[PDB]
Design a protein around this ligand. Structure first.
Ligand code: MED
Ligand code: MED
Ligand code: ZN
Ligand code: ZN
Lengths: 178, 178
């Protein structure tokens, strides 16, 4: 499936880019991802990480869900990304333009730590811990959250998530500007 | 010493800022650190992390060493920063304008992971592992390095360091554009 993952992302990334009439170099400037890497991704040569995907989506001002718009069904089954084995994504609600929401249930394993690049301007995130203890980084600091605890923050800044207990599960609501 | 740390940083940050004729708001825009936090730091109300210090120095286009220029001696003794207990900094060579180099010996403990904001444009880093196993993040990926291994990268991008073994020690050369 790692190879099928590559082809899915490669083809849709190209569609998203071409639909916007963007060159690879212009897309590189927008996303902060090298033109070289973007070329490799579209050719199915490199498997992008979840963090790189968000970086690209942010630059294109697209939702994470947009990477699967050609085959919406895939999103509800895409739990394990090849380059992120200690993190599993369960999409509860794919991006909806009317509410601007994208909702995921994330499972962090082996005390994995996930740092992210800023998402698009104005994108806001909500976090609700379902199990374990985890920490969320933003505004230059880590915020520890136990089961049941919650918090929201402006995600258009360097941020991150980390499981303090070996395992942690949390709901993540990503709200895009309307 | 945590309090002495705060006063040292508070006073020199203000000097560096004032010497440049910058307002707090202008400094906020340059560094990406909120004006609120910058105000608290200068008043000795909040203890900045090593990551925040680099973020500020980068925006002011100053060296990390500049934060101790009022009392150079302090740098050679400042090993443990209050908000970074799993990371110890041993400055071997403070910033020198003729070579543009700043050299540190860093000890990471309890498999600590250190993510950093981009340093100033053109700043380059060299890494040489003295002990243990560690990983360095840049160009969207982690690079694992064992004892004796080395690597260099452009640090004006999101990057980071992580000890894979409980403890890891490495030399870090930070070269600023001349
Ligand atoms: C649903 S993927 C994990 C969450 C996403 N907001 C990120 O920063 O990576
Ligand atoms: C000497 S402090 C650790 C190294 C510094 N280049 C950083 O990114 O944090
Ligand atoms: Zn995020
Ligand atoms: Zn650095």
């Amino acid at each position: 499936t790692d190879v099928m993952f590559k082809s899915q992302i490669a083809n849709q990334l190209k569609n998203l880019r071409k639909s916007r009439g963007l060159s690879l170099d212009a897309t590189a400037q927008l996303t902060g991802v090298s033109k070289a890497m973007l070329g490799q991704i579209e050719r199915g040569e490199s498997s992008p990480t979840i963090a790189t995907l968000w970086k690209i989506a942010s630059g294109l001002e697209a939702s994470f869900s947009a990477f699967f718009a050609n085959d919406p069904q895939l999103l509800s089954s895409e739990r394990s990304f090849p380059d992120d084995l200690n993190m599993k994504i369960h999409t509860l609600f794919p991006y909806a333009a009317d509410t601007g929401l994208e909702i995921f249930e994330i499972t962090l394993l082996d005390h994995h730590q996930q740092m992210s690049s800023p998402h698009a301007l104005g994108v806001i995130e909500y976090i609700h811990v379902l199990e374990g203890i985890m920490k969320v980084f933003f505004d230059e600091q880590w915020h520890e959250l136990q089961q049941g605890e919650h918090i929201r923050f402006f995600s258009d800044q360097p941020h991150g998530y980390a499981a303090v207990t070996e395992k942690a599960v949390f709901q993540n609501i990503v709200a895009y500007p309307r």
